[PDB]
Design a protein around this ligand. Structure first.
Ligand SMILES: [Mg+2]
Ligand SMILES: [Mg+2]
Ligand SMILES: [Mg+2]
Ligand SMILES: [Mg+2]
Ligand SMILES: [Mg+2]
Ligand SMILES: [Mg+2]
Ligand SMILES: [Mg+2]
Ligand SMILES: [Mg+2]
Ligand SMILES: [Mg+2]
Ligand SMILES: [Mg+2]
Ligand SMILES: [Mg+2]
Ligand SMILES: [Mg+2]
Ligand SMILES: [Mg+2]
Ligand SMILES: [Mg+2]
Ligand SMILES: [Mg+2]
Ligand SMILES: [Mg+2]
Ligand SMILES: [Zn+2]
Lengths: 133, 37, 135, 125, 11, 137, 178
RNA sequence: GCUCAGUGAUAAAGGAGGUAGGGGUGCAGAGACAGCCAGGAGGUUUGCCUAGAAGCAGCCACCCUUGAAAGAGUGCGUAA
RNA sequence: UUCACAUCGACGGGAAGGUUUGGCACCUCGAUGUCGGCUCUUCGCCACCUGGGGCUGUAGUAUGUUCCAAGGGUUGGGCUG
């Protein structure tokens, strides 16, 4: 059981991933192409991924939330977030981008409604300095 | 063990006891051991 | 270091320290304050140190009033000086405080940070003191 | 509290015939001198010192070392303090006969028991 | 030591 | 702690959720994750109401609504189910399957109450076999 | 009077013979005999239901502390003669070993000499040559004692955890040499 | 009534579950303290910085959500 | 390195001692006299070494600091009133 952060449709570079989870006995090409196929099924985004491994070297992995900070960095059109959140505001997103970032991240949250997901994403955007209305 | 006139608990785990009349401080970690005097 | 800018005569009477000070009793500026319990003589250096200590330990908390000040001169004769041939040279300056007198006033903090800061202040004081809250 | 009573009787202060300048007093035989009781931490604290007469000639015993070694000295030394000092004092002190055991070889003298009017003299555990 | 003793009639 | 006012309004909210519902389901939980608590709270609040309460808080709310025959179900830890909207078998059926996945996860079924009557740990099997409103009507 | 310890009565199980004379208590259990004397204030009551409830003559702070202590004491001599007490200590290191032979416990702790330890009657010491040692005895005080005397010779050092330790121990481990 | 220090002979700031009182203020019988069983989540690996900073080197923000409760984290720990 | 309290500890405060340099003039003036060595003691503990320990930024050796401890020890020379 190990936690890594990988890019959307790119896998198996030598320094970031392969040695790290490959020293625990995990197959590199199966995890990398199953993860690229699962990020080809959903909208492609940078994915933190938790890969669970077992005694027989088989592995099952869960793709976590594509970062709400990266999704709200591409929704407000910016690159770098605000160095001082709630002091300097670096962009603005509409409520429809709230419901969109909370629909793409909805299978990956624990929220029981779309309004809870929308206020979670409005809380993360209130946290990195990005205004929302 | 430090020995001094003023002994205070220096963290949360510290305990001030009374041994044969003198006030001591026992703790988990050895650096926080003190004796009054 | 606090000190008067001018006086006519240099040298002065020891005086005598009695009673309560009824005037400095109130806390009129800030919120929390340090009250002098006992009849003593505060050098300017001590007030300086106490203020500095309270200021540094408070930091992010706002305001410190110094309600006293060393306006009475004090004189000393050198070492190996036989007694006679005049009163000595004023070295330093003191403020006379009597019980009930307020020393430090402090505002802009929670009561906890204030209790701690006032403690570290009262550590550089020659006298026993007290912690009081505004009415 | 006992040694006071003892001193009174040795000195003679309980006879109408008392005189400071004379011995009108009794003899007193103290028995079971290791069973004598003492309050507080005194057993480990009270300190019997005696001095050689050379410098650094001081010797100290705790009460208990003493009571294990030669326990009669304790009561002899506690009564001698309350007798007068000087000629009649010392000559008096010879009337105090102390034994560590429960037994005394004076049965010929027909000893009576000593009256104690003190309340607190008897300790109980 | 900055304190004195009591000599004679003081004492 | 909890003031007497908040506990009187809590027993009143539990009694108002008691008057509208046709069935009670008692469940005790010890040593379980919050994740399956929130999955059980993905499945439950839709068709039914789940309320976790103290022994006496359940005692004085159920005695008055005439559910009193369920008093032995309040010994030990207490979590309750009332059916406000949906039927009895659609609420009782998921709980026993969730108790078969919870065998190592520490769940046990104490008892249920339907028709004003008390059914034990095994007698709720019937309450599970009952069909949906489309098949009965 | 209000010590949460002295209120709880002690259960004397069958196999346990309780002989009470005045303030002196002699208990003869399956494993043997234990004797204790009570101080002035503590009065322990032998019930008709077969229980021991501790009461106190007067309440000084003295007697309060007393009765708490003695209720636990004589609960431990009862449960002591019934079942018994086992202290277990294991040894950590290279060459460290123990051998029970006759009346001695021989310890090789890395000293020059073999360390010999005279084992008291009341104690029975079982040894695992797998470097574990258990001592069993009817009296908590004496077993605890001897256990400590074992541990004394080479107390656990901070770095590599080496030395004699009790079965369950938190040992501060510093990183030496970094 | 008090003291257990042989204090009862002398000295201060400071320290203190010493001890015997007195006064406010908290909670509780829908059970308070201590113990013991479980939970301690989602955003998120907050933003900045940094080879890395993931509650826990440093800086700034310190909100929101699911909630019985859970700090953008009190301490330990990892190169992270 | 992180970490006030391993070790230091600025600005200030509270003391003990009576060994330094002093203030006083109670003391003795007739022949009650200062600093070093020799010989000869003796006592204090604020411990330099030797005995036992706690902490360490103690791996080991060696330290550092501190606790109890004054039983014993504490060289020979060139140089100075
Ligand atoms: Mg007056
Ligand atoms: Mg005036
Ligand atoms: Mg002061
Ligand atoms: Mg003096
Ligand atoms: Mg005294
Ligand atoms: Mg300090
Ligand atoms: Mg004269
Ligand atoms: Mg002469
Ligand atoms: Mg010393
Ligand atoms: Mg040494
Ligand atoms: Mg050492
Ligand atoms: Mg080293
Ligand atoms: Mg010595
Ligand atoms: Mg000597
Ligand atoms: Mg010497
Ligand atoms: Mg020399
Ligand atoms: Zn501590």
């Amino acid at each position: 059981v190990i936690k890594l952060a990988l890019e959307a449709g790119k896998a198996t570079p030598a320094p970031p991933v392969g040695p790290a989870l490959g020293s625990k006995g995990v197959n590199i090409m199966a995890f990398c192409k199953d993860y690229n196929a699962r990020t080809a099924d959903k909208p492609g985004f940078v994915i933190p991924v938790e890969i669970t491994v077992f005694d027989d070297k088989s592995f099952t992995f869960i793709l976590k939330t594509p970062p709400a900070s990266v999704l709200l960095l591409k929704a407000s059109g910016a690159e770098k977030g605000s160095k001082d959140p709630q002091m300097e505001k670096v962009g603005k997103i509409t409520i429809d981008q709230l419901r969109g970032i909370a629909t793409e991240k909805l299978p990956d949250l624990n929220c029981t409604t779309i309004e809870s997901a929308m206020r979670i994403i409005a809380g993360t955007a209130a946290n990195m300095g990005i205004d929302i209305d | 063990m430090k020995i001094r006139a003023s002994v205070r608990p220096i963290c949360e785990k510290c305990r001030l006891i009374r041994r044969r009349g003198r006030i001591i401080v026992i703790c988990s970690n050895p650096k926080h051991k003190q004796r009054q005097g | 270091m606090l000190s008067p800018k001018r006086t006519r005569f240099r040298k002065q009477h020891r005086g005598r320290m009695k009673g309560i000070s009824y005037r400095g009793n109130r806390i009129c500026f800030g919120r929390y304050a340090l009250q002098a319990l006992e009849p003593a003589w505060i050098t300017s250096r001590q007030i300086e140190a106490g203020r500095r200590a309270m200021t540094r330990n408070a930091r992010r908390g706002g305001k410190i009033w110094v309600r006293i000040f060393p306006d009475k001169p004090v004189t000393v004769r050198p070492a190996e000086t036989r007694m006679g041939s005049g009163k000595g040279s004023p070295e330093y300056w003191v403020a006379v405080v009597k019980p009930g007198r307020i020393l430090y006033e402090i505002s802009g903090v929670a009561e906890n940070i204030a209790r701690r800061a006032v403690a570290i202040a009262a550590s550089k004081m020659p006298i026993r003191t007290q912690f009081i809250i505004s009415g | 509290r006992m040694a006071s009573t003892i001193a009174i009787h040795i000195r003679g202060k309980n006879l109408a015939s008392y005189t400071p300048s004379v011995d009108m007093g009794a003899f007193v035989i103290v028995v079971n001198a290791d069973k004598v009781a003492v309050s507080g931490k005194k057993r480990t604290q009270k300190l019997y010192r005696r001095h050689s007469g050379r410098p650094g000639g001081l010797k100290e015993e705790t009460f208990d070392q003493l009571q294990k070694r030669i326990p009669e000295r304790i009561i002899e030394h506690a009564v001698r303090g309350m007798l007068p000092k000087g000629r009649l004092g010392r000559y008096l002190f010879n009337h105090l006969k102390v034994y560590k055991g429960a037994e005394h070889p004076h049965q010929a003298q027909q000893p009576i028991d000593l009256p104690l009017r003190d309340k607190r003299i008897r300790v109980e555990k | 030591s900055s304190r004195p003793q009591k000599k004679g009639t003081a004492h | 702690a909890i003031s007497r006012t908040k506990k009187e309004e809590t027993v009143e909210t539990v009694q108002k959720h008691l008057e509208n519902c046709y069935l009670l389901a008692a469940i005790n939980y010890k040593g379980f994750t919050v994740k399956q608590f929130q999955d059980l709270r993905k499945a439950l609040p839709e068709n039914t109401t789940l309320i976790v309460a103290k022994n006496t808080l359940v005692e004085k709310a159920v005695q008055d609504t005439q559910w009193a025959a369920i008093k032995p179900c309040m010994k030990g830890m207490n979590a309750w189910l009332f059916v406000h909207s949906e039927e009895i078998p659609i609420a009782i059926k998921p709980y026993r399957t969730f108790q078969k996945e919870r065998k190592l996860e520490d769940n046990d079924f104490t008892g249920a109450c339907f028709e004003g009557k008390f059914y034990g740990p095994g007698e709720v099997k019937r309450l599970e076999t009952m069909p949906s409103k489309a098949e009965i009507f | 009077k209000e010590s949460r310890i002295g209120k709880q009565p002690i259960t004397v199980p069958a196999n346990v013979a309780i002989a009470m004379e005045g303030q002196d208590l002699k208990v003869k259990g399956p494993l043997g005999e234990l004797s204790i004397t009570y101080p002035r204030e503590v009065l322990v009551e032998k019930q008709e239901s077969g229980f021991l409830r501790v009461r106190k003559a007067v309440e000084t702070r003295r007697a309060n502390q007393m009765h708490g202590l003695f209720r636990t004491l004589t609960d431990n001599m009862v449960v002591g003669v019934s079942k018994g007490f086992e202290k277990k200590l294991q040894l950590v290191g290279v060459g460290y070993r123990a051998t029970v032979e006759g009346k001695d416990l021989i310890l090789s702790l890395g000293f020059s000499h073999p360390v010999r330890m005279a084992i008291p009657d009341e104690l029975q010491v079982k040894v695992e040559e797998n470097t574990k040692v258990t001592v069993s005895g009817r009296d908590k005080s004496v077993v605890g004692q001897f256990a400590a005397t074992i541990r004394s010779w080479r107390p656990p050092e901070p770095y590599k955890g080496k030395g004699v330790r009790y079965v369950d121990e938190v040992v501060r481990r510093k990183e030496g040499k970094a």
